[PDB]
From a paper:
The [name] protein from MRCV (hereafter, [name]) localizes in viroplasms of plant and insect hosts and, when expressed alone, self-interacts giving rise to cytoplasmic viroplasm-like structures (VLS). Using an integrative structural approach, the C-arm was found to be dispensable for [name] dimer assembly but essential for the formation of pentamers and hexamers of dimers (decamers and dodecamers), which favored RNA binding.
The careful analysis of the recorded data clearly exposed doughnut-shaped (torus topology) pentamers of homodimers (10-mer D5 symmetry) and hexamers of homodimers (12-mer D6 symmetry), representing 80 to 85% and 15 to 20% of the particle populations, respectively. The doughnut-shaped [name] structures reveal dimensions of 12.5 nm × 12.5 nm × 8.5 nm and 14.0 nm × 14.0 nm × 8.5 nm in the decameric and dodecameric assemblies, respectively. The full-length dimers are settled in a parallel mode related by the respective 5-fold and 6-fold rotational symmetry axes holding their C-arm protrusions as staplers, as previously reported for the octameric arrangement of the RBSDV [name] crystal structure. In this way, the C-arm of subunit A interacts with the neighboring (−1) dimer, while the C-arm of subunit B interacts with the other-side (+1) dimer. Interestingly, as a result of the loop orientations, the pore is more occluded in the decamer than in the dodecamer (middle and right). We found a marked ability of [name] to bind phosphate moieties in the three multimeric states, with a strong preference for the decamer. Remarkably, a significant binding probability was found on top and around the C-arm region, which was again enhanced in the decameric form. In this regard, the crowding effect within the pore that takes place in the decamer would promote the interaction between both sites, as additional and stronger phosphate binding sites were predicted by in silico simulations. This finding gives a potential functional advantage for the decamer over the dodecamer, which may be endorsed by the cryo-EM and SAXS experimental data, where the decameric assembly was the most represented species.
Numbering used by the authors:
A (entry chain E), B (entry chain D), C (entry chain C), D (entry chain B): 5 to 19, 44 to 70, 74 to 107, 111 to 130, 155 to 228, 238 to 264, 269 to 337
Write the structure that this text describes.
Amino acid sequence: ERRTFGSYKIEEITIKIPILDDGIFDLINYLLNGTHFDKTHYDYSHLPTLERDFNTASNYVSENYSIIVEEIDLNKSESISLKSPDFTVVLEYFKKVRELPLLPIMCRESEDSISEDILEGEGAVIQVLKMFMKGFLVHLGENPNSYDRQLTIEKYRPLLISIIGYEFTVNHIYYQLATFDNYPFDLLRFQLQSLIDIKERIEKDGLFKVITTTNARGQYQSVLLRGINGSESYLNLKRYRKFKVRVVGNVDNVIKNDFSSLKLDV
Amino acid sequence: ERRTFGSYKIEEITIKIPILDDGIFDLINYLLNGTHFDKTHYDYSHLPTLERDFNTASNYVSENYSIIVEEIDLNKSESISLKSPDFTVVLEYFKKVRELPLLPIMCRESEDSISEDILEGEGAVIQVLKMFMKGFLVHLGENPNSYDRQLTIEKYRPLLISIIGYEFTVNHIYYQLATFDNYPFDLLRFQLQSLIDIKERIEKDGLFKVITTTNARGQYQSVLLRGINGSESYLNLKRYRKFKVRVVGNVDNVIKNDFSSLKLDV
Amino acid sequence: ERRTFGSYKIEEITIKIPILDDGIFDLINYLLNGTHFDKTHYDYSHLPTLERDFNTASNYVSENYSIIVEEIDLNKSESISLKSPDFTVVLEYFKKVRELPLLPIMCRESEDSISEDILEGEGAVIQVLKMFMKGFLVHLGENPNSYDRQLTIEKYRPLLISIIGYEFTVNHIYYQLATFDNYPFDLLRFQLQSLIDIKERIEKDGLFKVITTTNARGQYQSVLLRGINGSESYLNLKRYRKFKVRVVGNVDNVIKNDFSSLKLDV
Amino acid sequence: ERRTFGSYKIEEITIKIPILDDGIFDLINYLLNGTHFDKTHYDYSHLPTLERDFNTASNYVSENYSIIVEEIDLNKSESISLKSPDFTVVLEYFKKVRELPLLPIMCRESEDSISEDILEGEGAVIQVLKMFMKGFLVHLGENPNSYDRQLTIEKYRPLLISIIGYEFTVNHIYYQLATFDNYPFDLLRFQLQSLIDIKERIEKDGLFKVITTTNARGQYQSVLLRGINGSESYLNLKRYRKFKVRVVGNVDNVIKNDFSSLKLDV
């Protein structure tokens, strides 16, 4: 049941709306367990250390997830969610509700205080997700679709955000890619090339803005990304699911048969 | 937009029930206009005179349909329907309701009184539909499906009925095929072979029974086919439709592009 | 209130749909108590040791059921259910929810470690159910019905599965019988004979497949039987009930009377 | 599709209420057409001239019905209804509403003015219906039912009324039978014998009463029968229908087969 890495899938519904399969839910869940690429749902020549870095990040995410797995009840669905710009995962577990900030880059006054092995773990993680996005876009170019003009990249925004955030906290392409989550596929397929210009000054002084609302019952902090267009965007949650693939097998071994052989009457 | 002759198609719906595309509605409609196989929605080596007999029958059905087309109003949907055993088509036309018995074989006391050219027209028609069913079943054998165990032949019953009716009014396979409209596909795919045994006596004395109910508002005649199992079946209407294929085109000319070529950052 | 062994019954409902009576719910319940054939709801000449093996299996199932009966509360309906391929029963009990795997054949690394008396108990059980199915099919042949073309064998699939599973873990007929749970009655009545052909190679390497879905809240294992058609099928639950027969007695002793005897006026 | 004369049938419905089939709707409809007993839905030794008188009455009713059939439109369901004590039938006919008093005995000041052939026609009719009721009751005695205690004779009241009306206008049994339309079947089956006593005086002075209500929009006449109990009853309409028997045939010719003959594995 393998599939190419960085993939997407397209599903039909009608009473003919299409929907996208992410390639995200599975990646997160695999990273939870430290599963290695060999025993994964996933021809990667131009992907150096794809399994190598992949498994390193799998391991790193595995212990990090275990860090909060310890407190979890045995008894206490799965609706994983992500938040920009520290790129935090969100989980729940019921009887029959926590988070973990995988890549906190908002504020880190421990540049040398944080050990270098941990730093390498994050660097592997970000490399994995970045070239993951690269594979996703090359896959986009590979096999187009009727519905290429029907949906947008909007899912993948925060990952690009984390990309450029690290880049500045160590580009134009990934930046402007993030700039328009509403941007459509076949568009990129046509004009991926010249998307280059703000030039220096709106990002020399912080890539993003932070504003907190004193809602008198809490302090709703919020991040406002800044785009090459010279604009801003609210960062927002996007809870995920994963479609429950049904249990159908395959015709694979069915014995096809001839009919002229049978003495059909005429 | 060609397709193989005698074809079927499989469509998914969910809130994953499959549905069948007949290869019947289109055939009837084509036969209405006398359209020739060249300009039809349809690799036919083992199908002798397929286009030849096909177009002969197209012509014959075209005039026959015109016989009642004349009375039709300009102004006065399409929900074509069929009745066994004289294999009659049923039409309607509204402002914004008739029939024609294509192959009346119940009673014909004009064996030589009916002209031989008309007889040849019907013989071409029945040959066309018979080898049509042959193509349908060979197509069944060709490409199986997950859903081969989910539906039955029930649509095609009356055609087989007409087949054997002509045969007797000039076999075991087509007969027993008709005998169980509820019969499933992949079943036939497995045990098409030995379906041979009633032996002579229930069909020497008429293949079918006729019973009329004096409903005091009419005389509902009805035909009761007799099957190799030694049983009977009510013959019933089955109104047809045809799914309205949407207007989507194709990725056909889309320019796929490379990505390692673009100076992606890493 | 006796009935023939391996029986079935047919019931009408309308606002004229028929329904089947299994001969399964009762068999299971009888086997629960170790009840002997004499004091059962059940002319068995061709059924050697029918009561003998029947009562042996009744005893074996009785202790096996008692094995989990012990934990049951006094206070804590009946909706018995079965699962292939280890052929497990499923029970519940409420105040006003367990199982037992009668014939676990999926994995048994105790071929000589399991005592021979237990093995004989299972062998008696499987013999009982197998010739039970034999009686069911001979009964099918005996008295046909209007509705023989209206339903399928689908209920009895897992039992046949267990049959062939034991056979391989010690045939074509019972195998192919299982292969199409959707297979219709009067069909079998006609073509029971030649249903023989995969030939060796798809079953030399395991009769079935096992696939588990890591649903992130559990590990849904599932079994995928392989059929002579060269295909697969999901194994599925089928919860049972039993119709509550009403309390009507009989005209049995009613005194029929003459009327010409009474001095009717004319 | 024959059945015994004067018959009844019992049908089940549940969400196990039984319903009765009359043997009345059919009799009326047959009498409408003058159909003869040979070509009717109907072992009559104790029924002298059953077909003879039956066909005489069939003829008489046929012309009488034709008397009003003449005015009927071609275009202008069937819900035949009956009224005591002149025992009048009630019909309707729509595009997609009359009556006829078969046996007017309320007032006839033409005792010799009415021709004797017409009189013989009515006498045949009344004999037919009377011994019809006789057959119905002997059939009741013949085959009892679980539901014999669930319904009453109420349908057949007016016919008995006409019987005794003629008798007086030329008994105890048929009289008292009519007296309690609510009377139950198996009751009669037990105590048919001694139902004999008003003695002369309430019927010497008219068997019935007539009362008309001047409803200021019409004159609703009504008849009030008098019973051996010394009581009265309103005479009332009872519109009829007839259940639409479905089109199912028969297993009649099905080939039952052996199973020990087939080389079943064990």
